Design a protein around this nucleic acid. Structure first.
Lengths: 36, 142, 207, 58, 175
RNA sequence: GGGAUAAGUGCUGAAAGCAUCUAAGCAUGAAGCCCCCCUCAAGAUGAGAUUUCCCAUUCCGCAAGGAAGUAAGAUCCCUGA
RNA sequence: UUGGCACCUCGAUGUCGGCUCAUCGCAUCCUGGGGCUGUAGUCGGUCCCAAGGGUUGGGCUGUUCGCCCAUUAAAGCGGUACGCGAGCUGGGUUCAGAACGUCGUGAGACAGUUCGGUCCCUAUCCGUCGCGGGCGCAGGAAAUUUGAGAGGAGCUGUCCUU
């Protein structure tokens, strides 16, 4: 997904700032977010 | 009645090596020489150019992201027919248009920004056929 | 890429091998003479000038009389390059002719089109006529130039002009036969250029 | 002529922003700026004034 | 809780030079590896001990501190052990062999898939199921096997195509 | 078809011992971009190129220069497409 | 878009909509490529990049819009003086004629309706699209060129196999 309020949902989600974009990466692939 | 020269001016060929230099801080150091901001017989309308042959046109660095984020724009007179291009395409394919566009952006435009620009040459490093004029090496002021 | 050049004559129908019917051109293009070998050791690029359809000496000049001295033949009207053949198998003075081609060689063909003269906006660009009735006076004409705010005509707005006279490549043809007995090509389809104009018969860019 | 001072003051390694401080101190020189220029027509008369500048630049 | 202050041991026989600047050229039985390092990193080579002597303490340097050691820790122990990966074909009309040195995969596309390895890379064919790449550079070997997994990426319903050994595919119950 | 790219997808790996597509390093990837295909085009005053030609006159102006006749070629004029 | 304000124009800036000719912006209808799927394949929803190209023939009404007929890969929006009347058509609004309802005591009135109702211009300049004459290109000439740069093309549907 893509949204300006990128947050982890469950505690299995890491928040990794790639490429100037605060991306959240997790196990479950419905957590997959980005502001961009 | 101060002095103002006319057709008694002697022109002296130079060489600037752009190797570990930015774009960018030497254009404003080649423009002032092409326009003649160092000869004391400086009368602004009389083509005072001791002029520069640039060597190592293939070697120019420029800081920041600006190989890929600085982009040229050469729009035609046809509608929406601009052909833009990044600096990395211009550093590889032909930088002879990189520096000559830079100096042409420096100079006062008109009929001197042609005549100051007819003085400049750019050669890709380091070969240039100007043996028969012997340019002294202008190291830069920085 | 092989390529010869020459006049054409006209159109025919030649059926072959089936009940077919083939639209066939007739080309006079034999034989070419290699007059000058453009070399990348001197000029940067690789080409071969070919001359065709020799003329009598009243029509040829001393700058051009001496130009055929390297091939040592008569003066010759129609000269063009060809970038750029497999290097080389040619010598300056070797009479290139029809023998290369065959029934199956896919071939692009270039030539200077039939000039029709000064023609208007429908015929020159395929533009469409307005209404021919209903009181309308606007017919046969190109109509609206552009908007109002830029206050000018954008470059490229189609208009009347002189139609024709360009050089047109027409691709992917099929050379039908080879007639080195009569100096005659045979190409499927329509080939641009008016009657008896000059036509360069290349080999194509495939596939 | 302010350009025609820097085109001579930089031959001797100074800047107009510093040179016209030098003439204001070493000397109270009220030299005409066309004529501290002219001091170029007959160089190195200007440099010997630029020599007078550097002594109070230290 | 650092990496570049750990030590690299070379007993035998993976010999490492200080070929300036700074082209640290590993040798050994398997081959030779030449990683070029940026000039802030000042490698101090003790008695059989490769190290890292950092220039200073910035976030530029710290992020470059642990890497230049742990590139070599991949390199030096790669000219003794080598490196290899394990691919695990799961599927029905899916099989594997090599021919010449191309890797012929009859993945369920209507044409077979061939993967040409590079020099110093040995993609073994152990059996019909598994495929093993073997080489020296981890940024090459795993990257070649990443060029293999994208032939048939594992669908979540039936985990198909190329698949690393071992690996857990998230499973859906398609109905 | 070739070459670099978008969103992706990554292989390595740190800072933050693991992890982590990135921060150094290497990829792949679009009818997008740049060429390849076709057309114009050195008035591109930065006027490019190679081939082959005609020659290096006659007079004035001591000179700088200016005329008159002429080669290579072309033009007017004519039959036309 | 309906608006507010009255700041260019009331010694005139032609107003709706069609026909031509387009360009451009993408906030995308397709087509190319992907994350997620409450994605088993099939066909989708949704979010991403992407303007290169395509973006229909009617019936009705002046209609833009709208509905419906049948196709389609789809039948995108939107700006450009709600593009475009010194390029066209006037079908409506809003000239006089003429009626009908309504209102007024009456002349007449009405964004309530209806039938009829002179759409002028030899292109000066800049533009645009073709054609020429000079001159220059360190001597005059004839051929063939190179390509810095400029455009054009850029769409896809089926079917059969696998």
């Amino acid at each position: 997904k893509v949204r300006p309020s990128v947050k982890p949902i469950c505690e299995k989600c890491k928040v990794i700032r790639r490429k100037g974009k605060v991306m959240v990466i997790c196990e479950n692939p419905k957590h997959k977010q980005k502001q961009g | 009645t101060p002095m103002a020269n006319a057709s008694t001016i002697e022109r002296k060929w130079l060489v600037v090596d752009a190797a570990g230099k930015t774009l960018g801080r030497l254009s404003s150091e080649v423009a002032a020489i092409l326009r003649g901001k160092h000869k004391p017989t400086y009368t602004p309308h009389v083509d005072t150019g001791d002029h520069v042959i640039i060597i190592n046109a293939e070697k120019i660095e420029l800081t920041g992201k600006k190989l890929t984020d600085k982009i040229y724009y050469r729009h035609t007179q046809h509608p929406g027919g601009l052909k833009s291009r990044t600096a990395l395409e211009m550093r590889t394919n032909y930088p002879e248009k990189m520096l000559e566009l830079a100096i042409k952006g420096m100079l006062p435009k008109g009929s001197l920004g042609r005549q100051m620009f007819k003085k400049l040459n750019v050669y890709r490093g380091s070969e240039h056929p100007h043996e028969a004029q012997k340019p002294e090496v202008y190291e830069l002021r920085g | 890429t092989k390529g010869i050049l020459g006049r054409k004559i006209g159109m025919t129908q030649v059926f072959a091998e089936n009940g077919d019917l083939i639209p066939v051109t007739v080309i006079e293009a034999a034989p070419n003479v290699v007059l000058q070998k453009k070399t990348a050791e001197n000029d940067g690029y690789e080409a071969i000038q070919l001359g065709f359809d020799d003329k009598r000496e009243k029509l040829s000049n001393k700058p051009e009389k001496g130009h055929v001295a390297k091939a040592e033949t008569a003066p010759k009207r129609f000269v063009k390059e060809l970038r750029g053949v497999e290097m080389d198998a040619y010598e300056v003075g070797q009479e290139v002719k029809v023998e290369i081609f065959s029934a199956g060689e896919i071939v692009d063909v270039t030539g200077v089109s039939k000039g029709k003269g000064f023609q208007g906006a429908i015929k020159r660009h395929g533009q469409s006529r307005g209404p021919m009735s209903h009181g309308s006076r606007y017919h046969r004409r190109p109509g609206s130039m552009g908007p109002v705010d830029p206050n000018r005509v954008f470059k490229g707005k189609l208009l009347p002009g002189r139609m024709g006279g360009e050089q047109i490549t027409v691709q992917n043809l099929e050379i039908v036969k080879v007639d080195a007995e009569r100096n005659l090509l045979l190409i499927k389809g329509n080939v641009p250029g008016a009657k008896k104009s000059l036509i360069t018969v290349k080999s194509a860019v495939k596939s | 002529w302010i350009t025609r001072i820097n085109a001579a003051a930089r031959m001797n390694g100074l800047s107009y922003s510093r040179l016209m401080h030098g003439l204001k101190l070493s000397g109270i020189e009220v030299n005409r700026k066309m004529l501290a220029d002219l001091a170029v027509n007959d160089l190195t008369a200007f440099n010997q004034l630029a020599d007078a500048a550097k002594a109070q630049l230290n | 809780s650092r990496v570049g202050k750990k030590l690299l041991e070379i007993p035998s026989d993976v010999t490492v030079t200080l070929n300036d600047n700074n082209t640290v050229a590993v040798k050994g039985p398997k081959g030779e590896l030449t990683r070029t390092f940026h000039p802030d990193m000042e490698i101090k080579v003790e008695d059989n001990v490769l190290t890292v002597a950092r220039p200073s303490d910035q976030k530029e340097h710290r992020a470059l501190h642990g890497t230049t050691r742990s590139l070599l820790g991949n390199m030096v122990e790669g000219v003794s052990k080598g490196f290899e990966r394990g691919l695990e074909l799961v599927g029905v009309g899916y099989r594997a062999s090599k021919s010449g040195n191309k890797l012929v995969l009859n993945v369920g596309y209507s044409h077979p898939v061939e993967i040409v390895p590079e020099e110093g890379i040995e993609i073994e064919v152990p059996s019909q199921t598994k495929v093993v790449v073997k080489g020296t550079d981890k940024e090459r070997v795993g990257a070649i096997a990443a060029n293999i997994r994208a032939v048939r990426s594992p669908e979540p319903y039936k985990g198909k195509g190329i698949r690393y050994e071992g690996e857990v595919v998230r499973r859906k119950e398609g109905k």
